[PDB]
Amino acid sequence: RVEAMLNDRRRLALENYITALQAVPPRPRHVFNMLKKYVRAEQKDRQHTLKHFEHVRMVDPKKAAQIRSQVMTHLRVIYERMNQSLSLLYNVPAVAEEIQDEVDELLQKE
Secondary structure, eight states: OHHHHHHHHHHHHHHHHHHHHSSSOOHHHHHHHHHEEEEEEEEHHHHHHHHHHHHHHOOOOOHHHHHHHHHHHHHHHHHHHHHHHHHHHOOOOHHHHHHHHHHHHHTTTO
């Protein structure tokens, strides 16, 4: 149940920044913070998927090959879901543009 555990840290992190979004007035500088945290979470999830790929391949090689397609979507879900979160905040073209500039600039160093 580790995969689900990683999702929580990312979920709450996303739902947490969203709270500031609705704050009104929202803190585009505080909201961008939770983002870098939520992001770092989705990263651990992706890497966690890789481990599952080889793990299931060792314990369950038969199904491991059948679940491959599932484990694959997992990695995509990490980045794909990231795009979904942006849409939620994008709702605020005003904040979305201010946070996006600093957010993208904050992860560059990563």
